[PDB]
RNA sequence: AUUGAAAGUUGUAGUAUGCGGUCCUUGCGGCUGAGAGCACUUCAGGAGUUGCCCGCGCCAGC
């Protein structure tokens, strides 16, 4: 199965993926450049923007929390159940699962 | 079909997690919209005008 989605959303006082740190002040937001019209020839403004993949690991957060709940949930990696996204970073050849059990990341067979 | 023929510089990655622009504060105290002032002074509801003129309580009644 193939789905696609696209629309359009209202979003109102949101500070949704900034810039700068916790600790720094003045955090900013992320901006972006694109290509309008403005009733004559292309050009570019910079507007505020979420990336994709703030997104990307948002469906990751709600994949882990609807997936957690059915029998099969035990099949899942320990740092999924800390939504965190640090798939077999560098340097490890050995992954844990959910209850434990130790995989080995020697062919994407048992890994899948 | 030619310095030629095939050729992903690629796959995974939240610039994040927490945080009262907050606590105290009389736009308050005193202050006559007050004191002097005739809506007064002179004015006939007045002069003239018949409640008039004619009229049987009447004739027959032992």
Known sequence: ??????????????????????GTNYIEITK????????????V????????NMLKHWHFVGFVDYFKTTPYGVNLTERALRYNGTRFGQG????????????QLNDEATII
């Open 32 to 43: 972006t450049k694109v290509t309008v019209r403005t009733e004559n020839g292309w050009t």
């Open 1 to 22: 199965m193939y789905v696609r989605i696209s629309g359009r959303i209202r979003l109102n006082a949101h500070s949704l993926n900034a810039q700068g740190g916790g």
């Open 92 to 103: 490890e050849t050995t992954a844990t699962k959910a209850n434990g059990a130790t995989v």
């Open 45 to 52: 403004v910079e507007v505020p923007a979420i990336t994709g």
